[PDB]
Design a protein around this ligand. Structure first.
Ligand SMILES: *[C@@H]1O[C@H](CO)[C@@H](O)[C@H](O)[C@H]1NC(C)=O
Ligand SMILES: *[C@@H]1O[C@H](CO)[C@@H](O)[C@H](O)[C@H]1NC(C)=O
Lengths: 120, 75, 495, 75, 99, 99, 120
C-alpha cells in the first residue's frame, strides 16, 4: 500500500528527493514517517507528516536539512535531504502510523530506497 | 456568478436584436412568478407587511411588488 | 480521544426512570452521555448511506447542435414546413424574414421562416431518489474509559460501530466490560428523503430539494427514458437569432456546469461516486442504559504511586485530559481521583471519565475531568504518594451559562422541534415545548420558504420596528419577539 | 439561467457547511454595492422617489432600500 | 468580447467588472490570474479536512451574462453588423440620367 | 482593425498540485511556499486538533491549502482604436435598371 | 466550388437522394437548382431552393415526387426522388444561380450524378 521511488546515486553536496505513494486509504487516516538506516547501523527516525494536515515534524538531528511534503492531489509523500555526504549513504524507509501522538506503530513499511553518495 | 450581471442597462442598444433578447425579456418575470407559486407563504407575509407599513393604497402595492420581487432575486 | 478534540461535542447528563435518554446524533458532532453509576459513552454518527437509488430526472448541461436546416414560405402563403419538425430531437423555431423579388418570392412582405437543428446531449446532471427504507446509518459507540485502541486490529475490542436501518428499530451494541448498549433510533424521520434528490453532476453530488430539482430550467429526460434523445425543454439551452429579420440561425448555449454549480449554492455536497454516502444530517436515537455496566466496578482502589506522563491539556469543552500511569501493585485497580479546592475541603470537580481504572501496570490511562472555574487541585492517588496538581480554569460561570444558552439556540436553529428531544427524558415540559415548536416552525417555514438570509434579516427588522411602534403591549411584545427570532435565524442561517 | 435559482431557502440545511456558503453569503450584497457605485444616477432618482412616495421616514427608507435592491436584481 | 467561436460588443466597464479570473492581456505565459478565488471553492466540511475544487465551465453563465450585448463577428476580422453612421450627403454634382 | 487585448478572463480552469499546511493550536497561522506563488490559489481555515489528530494541545489549529490554478478556456476582451474603424456604405442610383 | 455526390445505381420503385456540397459563399448568397438530363434527351428543370431561406419550389411535373433540402451545418443541398422508375433514369446536375426571382443564369455547375435505374 506504500510504494517508494527507485534507488538513486547522488553526489556529496547534492540533494535527493524520495517519494511514497499512499493508496488513498493511508492518506487522510494515518501519518507517514521517514526512517533511514546507514549500512551497518541501526534505524534512525528522520521525521513524519500527516498528509491530510500537512505539518511535518523532524528529528533534531535532521532538522534544517530534511523536508517532508505531501501532494494531496496525488496521494504521495516526499522526503528531501539536502547537503548529502558519504555518511548519508543509507536505505530510506517510509512507514504509516496512526495520527495519534502516543501511537507510533509502523505496521506498513516502504520497501526502502537506497541512496548512494559516491562517484562510481 | 457571472450570470447575475447580464449587461442589460448598458445603453449602446442598436436596432439589431441583441443576444438572447427574446428569452431575457421575460425570464426574470417568469422566475418571480414561479417563486410566488412555489412559496405562497412568504407572499402572504409580504402582503400583510406592505399593508401594515403602507399608509396609502399606492404605497401598499408598491411595497408589495418590491418585496415580492426582491424575495426570489435576493438570492 | 475521537470525541475529545471535536468542537461540536455535547454532554448529556442523566437518564429517565426507565434509564433511557434520547439523543440527536449529527454528522460532525459527537455526544458524550453520562449518568450516575453508568459508564460515560461517546456517540458519533459517522456514515449515512442511501441504497438502491432510482433515477428521477436527467438534466442536460452541455449539448451540441447539428443538422441545422431552414425552410420558408413567403408572405401571405402560410408557414414553412420542415420534415425535421416531425422529429422531437430537433429544436425548431418560427420567425419572419423580409422577402421580395430579390430574396426569391413574388410578394413584398414578411415571409415565414422556421429553423430546425438536431439537439444532442454531451454532459448529464442525473438526479436520483432513494426510499427511506434503504437508509442505513452507521454509529460508532466508544466507552469513554481513558483507554483507547490504536487504529488497526481493534476488531470491536474497544469502540463498536452499529448499523441503524429502518428495518430494525432496536440496535444492540455489546461493549466488552460494559455490558450491552441498546440504541433505538428513528431513521425514517431524520431526513425526509422523499422530498430529497441525490443530484450527481460529473463526480460531484448534492442533496437538493425535490421541488427545486424539478424546477430547474434545463433540458431533461424523464428518468424512465432509455433512448436518451427526446430531450424536452431544449429551448433553455439553444438560442435562435434573427438579427435584422433577414436570416434565421441557431446556436447552442454554453456548458451549464458553472451556472449549475452557482445554482447549487445552499445545498450540502454529498458523495455519490460509489455508494451514495451522506455525511450530513442528524439521527434521533433513544439510548437504553439498562444493561450498561461500569467496567472498573468490583475493583480495589489503587494504593500505589501515580505519575502524570503527559501534561494536563485543556480541551475546547471546558474539561481537562490527564494522562497518568500507575507504578504500584494490584494492577487491575481503580484510580483515586479528586478535584478539590485550594483548602482540600470540598470536592469541586466531576469526572467525565467516570470510574477511571488501571488495567495494566505500565499502560497510560488518560482521564477527562471537568474542573471548577478558578483554582482547584487535581489529586491523584492515595496519601503516601498522592499527586497534588494545581489547575486554573479561565472562564466564569455566567459566561458558561451564556455559552450553553447560545449553543441551545443554535441547536434549535439547525434542528427544529427535534432539538427538544436532544437530551430529553420524557417530561411534560419537553413535550409541550416540542408541540409549540412544531406549530411555530410550521408557520415560520411557511412564511420564510425560499428566502435568503438578507431577506430574513430585512423582514425581521421590519417586523421588530412594527412591534416597537405598536400601541398594544401584547402585539408589540409578540412582534418584537418574532422579529428578534427572525433576525437571529437570518444571522445563523446559510451555513 | 440555472444560476438565478439557487438552493438557498430550501430548509434542508444541517450543521455541515453548504456548497458555497462562505462565497455566496455576501455575493448578493457585494453585487448590489458594486451596482450602486457604478450607477449613482439611479440611486439619486430612487432616493427622490422614495422620499416623495414615502409618507414617513420608515416608508421612505424601506422603499429606497427595496428599489436599490431590485434594480440590480432584475438586470 | 470573443468567446470560443462567438463574439459580442460589450461595455468596457461591464467587461472590467466581470467576476472571473483575468490576465492583463500582455501576458504570454498566463500563470498570473487575478481573481482565482472566483473560479474555485474551498470547502471545510465540519472542521476536519480542508479541500478545494474548481467551479466548472463558465461558458453558459457567461452567455447568460451576455444578454443585451449585440453579437458581432471576430473570426475573419472584426466585423460589426450593428450600429449607425451619421453622414452628410452632397447632391450638388448629382444629376438625373437621360433628362 | 488591429484590435488590442486588455483581459483574458478564464471561463474554465483546473487544479493540479493541492498542498496543505497546518499549525497546532495556539501556534499561529501556518504558511506554505506556494502561498507566495501567483499561479496558486490558497485559503486559510481552522481544523479541530488534539491528541488523536497529532497536535497535542486540543484546540483549533490554523490550516492553509493551496492548489495550482490552470486555465483551460478563456474569453479575450479585445479593444480597437476609434481611428481603426472602417464603415462600408453602398450607394445605388435606384433606377429601373437591373442591378 | 460546387461538388456533387458520387454515382448511384438504383432499382425501380425506390427513392434516391443526391448530394450537392457548395461553398460558404455560394450557400449564403446564391440559389441552387436541380436539372436532370435523361439519356439522349434535353435538359429538364426539377426544382431549386435558396439554401439560406430553404423554401423549395419544384416543377409541376415533380410535385410529390422530388424533395430538395439544404444542410446549413454542412453547407450541402440534397435532392430526393421518390417512385424511381425506368423513365427516371438520367444524369442530375446542381447549378448555382442568384436568388432573385428573375435571373436564372447558371454560372456554376457540378459534374452530374448518374442515377442508373438498371442492373449491372
Ligand atoms: C445529419 O447529417 C448527417 C451528415 O452530416 C447525416 O448522416 C445524418 O443522417 C443527419 N441526420 C438527420 C436526422 O437528418
Ligand atoms: C506539480 O507536481 C508535479 C509532480 O509531478 C511537479 O512536476 C510540478 O512541478 C508541480 N507543479 C507546481 C509545483 O506548480
Amino acid at each position: 500500500q506504500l510504494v517508494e521511488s527507485g534507488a538513486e546515486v547522488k553526489k556529496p553536496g547534492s540533494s535527493v528527493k524520495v517519494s511514497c505513494k499512499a493508496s488513498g486509504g493511508t492518506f487522510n487516516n494515518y501519518a507517514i514517517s521517514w526512517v533511514r538506516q546507514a549500512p551497518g547501523q541501526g534505524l534512525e527516525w528522520m521525521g513524519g507528516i500527516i498528509p491530510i494536515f500537512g505539518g511535518a515534524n523532524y528529528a533534531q538531528k535532521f532538522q534544517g536539512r530534511v523536508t517532508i511534503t505531501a501532494d494531496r492531489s496525488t496521494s504521495t509523500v516526499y522526503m528531501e535531504l539536502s547537503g548529502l555526504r558519504s555518511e548519508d549513504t543509507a536505505v530510506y524507509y517510509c512507514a504509516r502510523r496512526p495520527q495519534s501522538i502516543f501511537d507510533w506503530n509502523f505496521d506498513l513499511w516502504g520497501r526502502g530506497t537506497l541512496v548512494t553518495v559516491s562517484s562510481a | 456568478s457571472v450570470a447575475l450581471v447580464p449587461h442589460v442597462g448598458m445603453g449602446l442598444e442598436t436596432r439589431t436584436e441583441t443576444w438572447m433578447s427574446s428569452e431575457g425579456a421575460w425570464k426574470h418575470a417568469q422566475r418571480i412568478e414561479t417563486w410566488v407559486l412555489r412559496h405562497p407563504g412568504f407572499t402572504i407575509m409580504a402582503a400583510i407587511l406592505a399593508y401594515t407599513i403602507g399608509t396609502t393604497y399606492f404605497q401598499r402595492v408598491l411595497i408589495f411588488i418590491l418585496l415580492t420581487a426582491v424575495a426570489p432575486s435576493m438570492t | 480521544m475521537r470525541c475529545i478534540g471535536i468542537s461540536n461535542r455535547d454532554f448529556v447528563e442523566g437518564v429517565s426512570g426507565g434509564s433511557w435518554v434520547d439523543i440527536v446524533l449529527e454528522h460532525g458532532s459527537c455526544v458524550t452521555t453520562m449518568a450516575k453509576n453508568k459508564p460515560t459513552l461517546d456517540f458519533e454518527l459517522i456514515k449515512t448511506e442511501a441504497k438502491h437509488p432510482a433515477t428521477l430526472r436527467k438534466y442536460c448541461i452541455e449539448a451540441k447542435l447539428t443538422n441545422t436546416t431552414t425552410a420558408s414560405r413567403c408572405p401571405t402563403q402560410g408557414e414553412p414546413s420542415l420534415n425535421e419538425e416531425q422529429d422531437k430531437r430537433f429544436v425548431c423555431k418560427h420567425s419572419m424574414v423580409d422577402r421580395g423579388w430579390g430574396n426569391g418570392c413574388g410578394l413584398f412582405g414578411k415571409g415565414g421562416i422556421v429553423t430546425c437543428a438536431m439537439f444532442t446531449c454531451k454532459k448529464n446532471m442525473e438526479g436520483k431518489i432513494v426510499q427511506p427504507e434503504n437508509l442505513e446509518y452507521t454509529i460508532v459507540i466508544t466507552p469513554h474509559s481513558g483507554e483507547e485502541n490504536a487504529v488497526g486490529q481493534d476488531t470491536g475490542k474497544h469502540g463498536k460501530e452499529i448499523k441503524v436501518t429502518p428495518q430494525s428499530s432496536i440496535t444492540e451494541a455489546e461493549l466488552t466490560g460494559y455490558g450491552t448498549v441498546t440504541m433505538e433510533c428513528s431513521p425514517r424521520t431524520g431526513l425526509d428523503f422523499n422530498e430529497m434528490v441525490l443530484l450527481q453532476m460529473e463526480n460531484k453530488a448534492w442533496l437538493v430539494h425535490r421541488q427545486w430539482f424539478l424546477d430547474l430550467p434545463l433540458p431533461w429526460l424523464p428518468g424512465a427514458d432509455t433512448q436518451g434523445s427526446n430531450w424536452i425543454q431544449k429551448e433553455t439551452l439553444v438560442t435562435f437569432k434573427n438579427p435584422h429579420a433577414k436570416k434565421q440561425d441557431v446556436v447552442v448555449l454554453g456548458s451549464q456546469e458553472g451556472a449549475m454549480h452557482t445554482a447549487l449554492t445552499g445545498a450540502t455536497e454529498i458523495q455519490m461516486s460509489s455508494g451514495n454516502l451522506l455525511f450530513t444530517g442528524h439521527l434521533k436515537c433513544r439510548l437504553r442504559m439498562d444493561k450498561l455496566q461500569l467496567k472498573g466496578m468490583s475493583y480495589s482502589m489503587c494504593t500505589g504511586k501515580f505519575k502524570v506522563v503527559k501534561e494536563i491539556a485543556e480541551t475546547q469543552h471546558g474539561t481537562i485530559v490527564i494522562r497518568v500511569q500507575y507504578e504500584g501493585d494490584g494492577s487491575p485497580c481503580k484510580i483515586p481521583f479528586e478535584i478539590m479546592d485550594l483548602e482540600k475541603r470540598h470536592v469541586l470537580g466531576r469526572l467525565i471519565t467516570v470510574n477511571p481504572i488501571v488495567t495494566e501496570k505500565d499502560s497510560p490511562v488518560n482521564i477527562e475531568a471537568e474542573p471548577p472555574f478558578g483554582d482547584s487541585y487535581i489529586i491523584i492517588g492515595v496519601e503516601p504518594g498522592q499527586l497534588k496538581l494545581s489547575w486554573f480554569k479561565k472562564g466564569s460561570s455566567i459566561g458558561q451559562m451564556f455559552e450553553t444558552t447560545m449553543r441551545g439556540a443554535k441547536r434549535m436553529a439547525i434542528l427544529g422541534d427535534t432539538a427538544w428531544d436532544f437530551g430529553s427524558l420524557g417530561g411534560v415540559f419537553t413535550s409541550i415545548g416540542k408541540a409549540l415548536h412544531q406549530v411555530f416552525g410550521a408557520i415560520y417555514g411557511a412564511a420564510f420558504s425560499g428566502v435568503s438570509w438578507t431577506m430574513k434579516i430585512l423582514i425581521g427588522v421590519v417586523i421588530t420596528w412594527i412591534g416597537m411602534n405598536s400601541r398594544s403591549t401584547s402585539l408589540s411584545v409578540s412582534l418584537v419577539l418574532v422579529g428578534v427570532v427572525t433576525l437571529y435565524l437570518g444571522v445563523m442561517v446559510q451555513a
